[PDB]
Amino acid sequence: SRMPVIKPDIANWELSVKLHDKVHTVVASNNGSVFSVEVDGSKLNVTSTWNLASPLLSVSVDGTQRTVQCLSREAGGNMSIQFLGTVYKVNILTRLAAELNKFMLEKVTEDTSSVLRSPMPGVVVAVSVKPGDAVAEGQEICVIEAMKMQNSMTAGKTGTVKSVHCQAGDTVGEGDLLVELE
Amino acid sequence: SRMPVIKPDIANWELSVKLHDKVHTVVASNNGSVFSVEVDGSKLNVTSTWNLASPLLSVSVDGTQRTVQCLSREAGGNMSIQFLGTVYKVN
Amino acid sequence: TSVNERIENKRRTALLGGGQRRIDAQHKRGKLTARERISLLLDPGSFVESDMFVEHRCADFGMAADKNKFPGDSVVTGRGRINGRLVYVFSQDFTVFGGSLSGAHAQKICKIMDQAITVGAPVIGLNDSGGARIQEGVESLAGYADIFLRNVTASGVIPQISLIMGPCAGGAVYSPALTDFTFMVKDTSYLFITGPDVVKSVTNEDVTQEELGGAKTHTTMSGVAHRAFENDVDALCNLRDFFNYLPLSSQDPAPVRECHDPSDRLVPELDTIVPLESTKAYNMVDIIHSVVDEREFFEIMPNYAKNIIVGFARMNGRTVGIVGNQPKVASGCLDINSSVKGARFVRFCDAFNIPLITFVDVPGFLPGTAQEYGGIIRHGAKLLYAFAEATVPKVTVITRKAYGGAYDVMSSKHLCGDTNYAWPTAEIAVMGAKGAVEIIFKGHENVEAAQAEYIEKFANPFPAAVRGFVDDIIQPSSTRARICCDLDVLASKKVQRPWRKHANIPL
Amino acid sequence: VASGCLDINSSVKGARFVRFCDAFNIPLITFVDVPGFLPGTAQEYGGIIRHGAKLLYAFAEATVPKVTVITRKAYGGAYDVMSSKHLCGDTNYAWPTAEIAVMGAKGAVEIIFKGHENVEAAQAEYIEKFANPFPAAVRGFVDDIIQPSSTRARICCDLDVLASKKVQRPWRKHANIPL
Amino acid sequence: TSVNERIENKRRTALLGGGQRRIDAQHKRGKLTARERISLLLDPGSFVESDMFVEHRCADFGMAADKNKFPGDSVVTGRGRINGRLVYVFSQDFTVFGGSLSGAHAQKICKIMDQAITVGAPVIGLNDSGGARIQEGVESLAGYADIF
């Protein structure tokens, strides 16, 4: 009551929807429970109750009944949507954000998921591996114990171990290399 | 108590006292109930109780007993003082 | 030439600012202009520009030349809305004299600072400056002082958010220290007082621009920046989302928004998160994400002081602040860095009527001379103070460890808390069984036998609960339901405190 | 000590003291002689920015009498941090040896005349005009320039008339110090 | 030239204000100067002058000339006491640009207005002015608004 809020009168949402390697032009408008969406000239009508908290969202698209799951959302437009069992990555920007985003530098960093370092100083009490051992994503590799706590270090890469640099009984600090994957 | 008042430390009052057609140089200092006044080099001591509301002000000037009346005062220095029956105008 | 022609010519120049060639370079470096950044931040069409025709009045050192007369004098100021909610903004334009601060520059920013305080609307600044404009001399120093005075006056009255979108040097680098949150853009924004040129000239040390004041340094090591975002477009998209959490003024209650997440659902996933073995760590974030509405959590300083987690979330539509321990890092112990981040967050949320939820799992304090000589005592008092003086709802749940003085520091009930829940795995004690029993039975025979009896009686949450320290012991799966119930009845809470000119925080 | 520069440790001690004195209505006297901030990675990585804001905040929010005298240097942002008049100060005095500037003559002139010939000649003119307390005083930054021998008399006069000072501030549940 | 010499030279000019010849004319007309009026009004020795070294910053229309640089910019401001009681005063000096009001002129008066309100002391103004200083234009109009 102190600060009136005025809902923007947005009649049309102009979106740039990037899939794998294509960018599609999509314009949507709301008519209540149904969104009228033009996808590169094709007219679709998506009707739902749009309960945004449920893990299962039931939609009807031009009479076709679909069930989809939204697994993650980011403010930057990234959405992870499971459609017919497969997770698709879509980046939805507004027209303005997409037009200006072209001015950003395409910097690329290195993925160093094969280099497993100690997150915490202490003594190494277990190593689950030797070179050649299979490693799954999330697999425990090393356990380092200090401050009456065992800090389990897991792999971020599937593969086999190339080298084990620190053994049980060794003392390691923060940032020291424990195991190197292939 | 909110705004302390500090009495100016005025040790000497240097006055220019104009009578009829003469201007005299007078320097006065306060020593309590008595003012020590130098009038063109002459030393006088004026002792009184200085009750400023009474129509009759009794003063003693170097042992000489006088009664005077102050009839009017102005902020501009004008005073009308009756001395020995005659009203004198002093600025 | 008519007056209308002159007006149109000034409008066109104000939009170009420093000129098209400068704008071209602005994009080459990978940066947006000050006006493009505002268009992204605010609701389309909601922005109204103020004082677009103001120019500097300095005539010395050639400043009277027509080539220096840039309408707008390096700042874009005005008002708008984000999702219908009123907000004031300003953005510094680097293409006009390097974004340096002039007298008139500050004046325009102060004007926005005064309107926002009077009405009670947040201010979001987009900072990018090369420092003071030396051509004016001391006029720019007064500019900084006036801005600083407004930033202090607005504290606890309106939220103040500062997003850094480029370099910042000189006196300008202190405004984010007075606002509530500072955000940066990775590899684009810097915060420093003097550049590497001065460090090399003064002392025999070798440093580059990124090492001295880069975004990675301030979000990972110094604890100055609350979060860095990858680029300009993502930074403003996340800023809109962050804005939606906060009230417009401290006179307003925490905002409540439409929510589809049932408030009475259970979270069975919690019953097995906390191991029975005391030396096994777990991720506190798994608990936070499962309790909060629709599993959305906004984490602050993800890479700094990782042993304590603070951030924003909603429960049943209402914005709440969450503080908790992270047992994975340094056993969940308190240290200097964690106390600084915690106290700052708690105090902001209290000032703007945002309820606090505390997830306690803390075995004590980080030992060692590194902390003793660092003033761990003086710094730990900051977090205890921030909780003790709070007047907003405080809901504490203890998930496992609470040993020693850390029990009270992490918002215990005796600091005017509202409710305090324990999970069956909680243990509240002055210290663990080993220390307590060896000290109690010091020099006695059969200490291990006495320890077995001690553990059976005290190694559990009951000797504290039966004394009134804990209100209930709940199945972890019900945690969300219990918190939701408390938040919706403590929201009308009001308390009084003795009058004091101002608080005196231990510092 | 350290040329009189501000650093992390000095800001912590200063801010704490200033805040106590303000809370219990004890006037503040400031003696300014500060060339800037202590440079180096030891301070940058230590949060010198976050910590310096503590002393600026402590002065800016003060409501008790503040009397500042500048005895010599006041360069850069340190001028405002050390309780400058524009932070709701009551009086600000300079001694004849005071110099108020964004930076010293060397930095300011080489930056202003960057790439120009006869910079040293321009520096001589710059020093004569700006290396003194006057370009600040004529703009209202300084109330008077006093013979140092009179400093005590001037301060005493201000303290005995500012003691009845009262100001208002917008209501806030509590203050929000930068920490 | 040392800084102390420059300071002394500014002090001497601030006391003369518009200059001795102007002061001579001031007396010829039967008027006291702004500083003589304050000395009469306040308790002897109680007056403390503020911002005596402030000068205008206008450079247009020849205002940058040394001949126009009058320290004090046509007002004498400060504080004192009458019979031991605190009072703030200011007095406009007609001998400097006719007593016309500049931006800086008003600023100094406003400064006195703000200190007096904060402590709770009366303000006594001695006014004498030819109006706005047209060389600055609209700066003097803002001056009036702030005083009002």
Ligand SMILES: CC(=O)SCCNC(=O)CCNC(=O)[C@H](O)C(C)(C)COP(=O)(O)OP(=O)(O)OC[C@H]1O[C@@H](n2cnc3c(N)ncnc32)[C@H](O)[C@@H]1OP(=O)(O)O
């Ligand atoms: C002690 C104190 O706290 S006060 C600090 C005083 N600060 C300053 O005066 C600026 C600090 N130092 C600098 O000038 C640095 O160059 C910084 C901080 C501006 C950073 O430099 P960069 O980000 O590389 O910008 P850079 O200086 O290259 O920009 C060049 C342009 O900006 C402008 N510019 C750069 N520095 C300044 C400055 N200090 N004042 C005014 N304009 C400037 C110039 O007009 C120049 O014009 P161009 O377009 O023809 O090149």
Ligand SMILES: CC(=O)SCCNC(=O)CCNC(=O)[C@H](O)C(C)(C)COP(=O)(O)OP(=O)(O)OC[C@H]1O[C@@H](n2cnc3c(N)ncnc32)[C@H](O)[C@@H]1OP(=O)(O)O
């Ligand atoms: C519509 C409105 O409300 S705005 C009103 C606009 N009116 C004005 O500008 C003021 C009215 N007109 C005048 O200027 C008249 O001359 C008045 C009111 C100043 C009265 O004039 P006088 O009292 O005779 O002073 P006079 O003008 O003779 O003074 C002369 C000196 O004062 C100065 N002076 C006089 N008028 C002005 C002025 N308007 N602005 C600045 N300086 C002035 C001159 O420098 C001159 O210098 P000198 O010493 O070499 O002579």
Ligand SMILES: *C(=O)CCCC[C@@H]1SC[C@@H]2NC(=O)N[C@@H]21
């Ligand atoms: C074994 O050496 C005991 C370590 C102490 C346990 C942890 S570490 C820091 C906290 N302080 C304390 O007394 N207990 C906690």
Ligand SMILES: *C(=O)CCCC[C@@H]1SC[C@@H]2NC(=O)N[C@@H]21
């Ligand atoms: C010579 O190398 C210049 C040293 C800088 C002078 C001092 S040291 C720290 C302060 N910062 C600054 O810019 N000036 C001050």
